Amino acid sequence: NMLYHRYLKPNSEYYKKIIYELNDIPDTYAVFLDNESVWKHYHVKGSTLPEQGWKIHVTSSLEDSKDVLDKVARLCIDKKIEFKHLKDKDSFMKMNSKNANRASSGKFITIYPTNNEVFVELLEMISLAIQDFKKGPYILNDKRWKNSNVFYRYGGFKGIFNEHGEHCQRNPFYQVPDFVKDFDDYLNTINNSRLGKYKIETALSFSNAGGVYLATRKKDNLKVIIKEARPSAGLDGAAQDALARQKIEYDALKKLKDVSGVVNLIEYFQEWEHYFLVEEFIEGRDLRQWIAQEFPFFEDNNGMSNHIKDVKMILLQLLDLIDSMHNQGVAMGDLQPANIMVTEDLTVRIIDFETAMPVNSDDRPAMLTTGFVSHEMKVSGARDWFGFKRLVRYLALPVLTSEDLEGYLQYNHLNWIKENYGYEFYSFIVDLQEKCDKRIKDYQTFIPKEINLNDQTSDFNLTSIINKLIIGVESSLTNDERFINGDIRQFEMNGGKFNFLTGGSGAAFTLTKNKSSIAEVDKWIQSVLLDNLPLIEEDGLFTGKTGILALLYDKGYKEVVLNELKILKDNINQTDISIRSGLSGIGLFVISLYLETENKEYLKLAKDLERMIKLNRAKDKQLKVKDWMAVDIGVIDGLSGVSLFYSALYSVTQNQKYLEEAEVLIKEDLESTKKDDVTGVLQTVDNKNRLLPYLSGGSIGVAISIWFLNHVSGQDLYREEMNSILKLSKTRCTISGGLFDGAGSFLLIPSMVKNDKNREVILNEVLNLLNIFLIEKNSYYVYPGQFSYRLADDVYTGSSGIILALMGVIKGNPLYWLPLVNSDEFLARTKVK
């Protein structure tokens, strides 16, 4: 999810992507680099090393980090010792940023002396060469010498990979082996309170920069936040350490001690070698959390006026607070929902000022929160106001957007606010907006956009939406190998450029269903794709070859598909049973091919795949998840998905066993659901205890599997659960718009509803949701990808997924997003009898 930032290349509506070598190496060394690892390996001579011994770590500050590798590595070659170091300055940053993992932070060079003797031998003569230098980050994993950047401790050298996941331990603190404890006592002997007035209960968070600690002042009982900043550790894009940031938080907290909204400074001192900022411990939630917990996501016809109250209250306080801050010449330089807190009585507080900057300064900040920023703002104070301006609309409609799409989605958003709230609240928002507009004009020449709401209208005609999204896709063909722009996964994942989920086949399949762009599709299939087939190892329905084979077969490439089918069993991944990428998805494809060709060899293969699924299930009951957005419940990556396979297999088999299995797999997924007490809506429960509606990981997925179970068998099982899931149609707003993870999921609800009067309401509800996202551009429609930061045309997040869902509604086909052979006939062919 944080990966998205890497794909916000300037001046594009699409997701597009934006060394420590030594001097004169002796031939006695083998050098291994890394397009994978952070480590640049140095193997010495020919002989390998002990599995575990005492190792030396060398840390280094930034100012001159090159002068510490130019020296230490050469004594690692004078004595001919084995070592490894970070690849590049870039890799240095990842290990030594605020963000970095403390466990192995600081570690720049790792030296491997064999054991005991050469270790102490080395550790001394290193410190003679690197003694006249700036100190680097202390490694909280190791022990230190004097004022030395030389560290040490015991651990494995070349970590084996075992059953429980060895790596032979590196922990946030210091440790001792129960084995070689004796030699530990040796070096012990060669090696040469202000916060005592606080009782530290617990720590909220730690980081590479330091901890944040809940403490009660010794005899006073006042709860305080204690913010640690250890020097030179936790670097910024700006190359500023934890300290420099802390002594900017300090300056600001005083300078606005008079503002009662701002957190109040208690004290600020030094200790061991660290620096501590003590502040007043505030109770409530950030606006992100407040929105998550308090926003009326479910549409009840008992009004939404309560929320209008609280928003108006919160925003006005915030308007005051920002004015106060700007009086004192300080801009809180990251104005966005994370940094605004709000107590149980809804008192607006600002808590972190590490990003504070003098208003009137035109310096690029270290950190920009996409969604609450614009490249138009060139001055610190104006950045605050723009933040607030966007935050204003956000509390009304909590749906992120980037500057690249804001030109479109402001229409959709503002129109939504009116249609759903009073005109009074619409006009409140739009006034407070323009109230911000020229608080900006104070700091900089800013000539704002003139918005007329009647220039964009929301669309509820399925044929119109499908037609216009198609015309969009046709107008948006890349002339390259991807065919369409899509999610970042086109670049991040194997086969992502070609597969059904994020690649060209998704669009080509969709365009084919709408009889559009035949020549463009034929060109892409012939010039690209067929040549890329041999390079896609994965067989997955969405992620790999099988979804592509569906496209290919429909388009007339029997010979290719039939040869692929011959190869399909022989080498088949068997650890994975999901619809996304495992045996269920493949099996579903294989059954569809059976139905189309009536070749009984495909039925046999389908039964072989089932046996593999049975085996996998027996082996262990833990599902394996490869995508970072994958969740082991529901239709895409869990057991509901596998039930799709059993149901389909049942249809071509008439064998009750498969039907009973289909049922059991749904039952199992239903155990991880939770019915809400107020609103009677059923959702799935994540492992992170998140509640999910979406097609990917959510209850809409489970409903689809119930529907298909019922479709093949002529039953009406799980009606109670079903009815509780269709109630999700009352959802207003979602984080994102896409079929898998966003609004598009909800389009699948109406396609499951038999009677029309009930359907038409549900359809209208879900089209209200779609219309937050559906972008009018030129004469046609396009669609925002994940987080509405850029447009996407793929199935996973973009317009192709929407089109398929919408055609699903028309056809009463909740399975229409699956890339199956034929598929216009699939329901008819799998129906009961």
Author numbering: 4 to 21, 29 to 178, 190 to 213, 223 to 863
What does the paper say about this structure?
Subsequent β-elimination by a lyase domain yields electrophilic dehydroamino acids, which can undergo cyclase domain-catalyzed cyclization to yield conformationally restricted, bioactive compounds.
Eventually, we were able to grow crystals of ThurKC that were purified with the leader but with most of the peptide removed during purification. However, a comparison of the respective C-lobes of the two structures reveals that the N-lobe of “leaderless” ThurKC is shifted away from the C-lobe. Many of the residues that stabilize interactions between the three domains are displaced and incapable for interaction in the “leaderless” ThurKC structure.
